[PDB]
Structure 1
């Protein structure tokens, strides 16, 4: 089903991205990526469409296109408004040059399933246009995502998704306990970071099949988080093994344990060009001179010129704050001590839908 396809996409995207970005922090929102591309698929046809939907993990013989979008619609309905169940907002926008008219079916589809705003722009005045998109995203993400467009090949259509997430720990870290500690980035790199601590009953697992130890923490509401510490030098072994089956196997093994849990106060961000990642995943027609975007508009034959994702993560003693945005441009064609003081993995899930909300590879917490 949908949860599984979205999780499979999330792990593949993460895996491909980690490989191409060996030193830098990885922080992404796979649910945001899925939603943007799923909405985009509505404007595609032929091989382009087939390739995009299969790349996203949907088998078009096991499920019709309508059932995919109804599924995303439910997810957006669930994630659109913030509340205590999940303090998260998520939304889509289509920025369109004034010279272009959407096809009626596409227009209704994006509004219906994705509650997409459609906003007319003058992309010949690219400075103004990109600034307007920038402040749209800045405002939607409570100021967390700035300068989405940095300065910059113009486009005549820009699809935008954003996500803002707040999580309060069910088990907060001890305020008095926080101290500066070494964080071992790599063999030649040590940084100082505030290191949080709690001594608590926490769901813990020392994995017997993979070289890692992990905990699962809850947020107030439906959010839940896995913190996975590979044995030193074993990051790639653990990353390679991530899957639905691994999550389920970790869930079956996690036991209430007394843990002295050390996790740094993380403040990180990244910007990722997702085009080559997507091509590696088999999503390629999108970008070629034969891209089939014939359901978007008959005013031009379009192709995607660029897909970019920017995301930010903050961890503190009280909880988590995370935000993400994607754009796609188109143009004419004993207490157990567990110490997170070196590269680790973060997986944030909605426990209700089992959507992968955010995924981290924290190389440097500062």
Structure 2
């Protein structure tokens, strides 16, 4: 839990930096914990260099933790995330879609069900359209219709797809009144704006920290339940400077520096954004290489070195509005014969 948080947060910011590097002008929205869980799931079947590259890419310090420690930690995380709750809707699922003829070690299938909650669905990938619809329906069901087209293309020689989804629906602790939402400017740059519905709250007391060293303002808005949002507002033209300082250490400093403050007015756009990603280049920059090559070692899955990753994809959606927030995401790991 302590070491899982630290590794997952390091991974989150490393992932964020590469996404911005790849597409510097774009909105960003993704689920770190979905991607971490999908790749941890994958590592269950990896061996030797393929394995250690994944665990190190996930930012786990292997001199301080072991493979068994990691998987048990993800098992506990998933159990905690899927606990019943009347305050907030939160769920995460894992699944594996396998060609029926593919022979799987009983140890792999058992550990997948036990540690990651995954069933094993027989899938005829040679009927790619049906196989695609089944996987996308699984994700659509898990995200309550929010993630509809996670799998766009599916090679007919696919042997296995590992899938993780996360669904999140929460109410603001202090919700916005829709009668206070009015069209206002959102500045894309100093001289260009777009018009958006700007929600507002008045006379609210919330955690606040003006970070003069980083030229940004940080506020924490709570959801009902154990979830909250850190909002970070860089001064005009300081986004890239703030992004360069994004790290576990910086988030910890922000968190320790929050103090309750009375805010006269808070203005927040009502918005919905969505992004989908091909994570292949990103994961390679993070050191996850052998799983994609002819030297891939996934013999923990089948007992032979006969599988290799072809593609890792991710899609996420974020919906912010007066009553609360809806967000969901899914990650898929596509695997072929080697």
TM over 0.5: yes
1:126 correspondence with 2:128: yes
1:170 correspondence with 2:170: no
Residue matched to 1:231? 235
Q: What aligned pairs does 1:268-287 form with structure 2 within 5 A after superposition? A: 268-287=273-292
Q: Say whether the 8 Å CA contact 2:132–2:154 is kept in structure 1.
A: no
1:203 correspondence with 2:215: no
Moved more, 261-270 or 174-183: 174-183
Q: 1:320 aligns with which of 309, 312, 325?
A: 325
1:57 correspondence with 2:59: yes
CA distance in 1, matches of 2:305, 2:8: 31
Moved more, 179-188 or 189-198: 179-188
Q: What aligned pairs does 1:225-304 form with structure 2 within 5 A after superposition? A: 225-259=229-263, 260-298=265-303, 301-304=306-309
Task: Output the TM-score relative to the length of structure 1.
Answer: 0.88
1:214 correspondence with 2:218: yes
1:330 correspondence with 2:335: yes
Q: Say whether the 8 Å CA contact 1:100–1:299 is kept in structure 2.
A: no
Q: Say whether the 8 Å CA contact 1:94–1:159 is kept in structure 2.
A: yes
3-state DSSP class of the match of 2:252?
A: helix
3-state DSSP class of the match of 2:52?
A: helix
- Give 1:188 shift: 6.9
3-state DSSP class of the match of 2:296?
A: coil
CA distance in 2, matches of 1:45, 1:300: 9
Q: Say whether the 8 Å CA contact 2:88–2:171 is kept in structure 1.
A: no
Q: Say whether the 8 Å CA contact 2:298–2:304 is kept in structure 1.
A: no
Residue ranges of structure 2 left out of the alignment (5+ in a row):
none
- Give 1:70 shift: 0.9
Task: Output the TM-score relative to the length of structure 2.
Answer: 0.95
Residue deviations 1:276-314 (CA, integer Å, cap 9, x gap): 111111111111111100011146611110000001010
CA distance in 2, matches of 1:84, 1:15: 35
Residue matched to 2:81? 79
Supply the RMSD in Å over aligned alpha carbons. Answer: 1.4
Residue matched to 1:347? none
3-state DSSP class of the match of 1:149?
A: coil
Change (3 A) 1:250 1:327: same
CA distance in 1, matches of 2:294, 2:83: 38
CA distance in 2, matches of 1:178, 1:317: 8
- Give 1:223 shift: 0.2
CA distance in 2, matches of 1:317, 1:54: 40
May I ask how many residue pairs the two structures share in their alignment? 333
- Give 1:151 shift: 4.0
1:156 correspondence with 2:156: no
1:45 correspondence with 2:47: yes
Q: Say whether the 8 Å CA contact 1:82–1:89 is kept in structure 2.
A: no
Q: Say whether the 8 Å CA contact 1:203–1:254 is kept in structure 2.
A: yes
Q: Say whether the 8 Å CA contact 1:81–1:90 is kept in structure 2.
A: no
Q: Say whether the 8 Å CA contact 2:190–2:236 is kept in structure 1.
A: no
CA distance in 1, matches of 2:174, 2:217: 19
Q: Say whether the 8 Å CA contact 2:96–2:160 is kept in structure 1.
A: yes
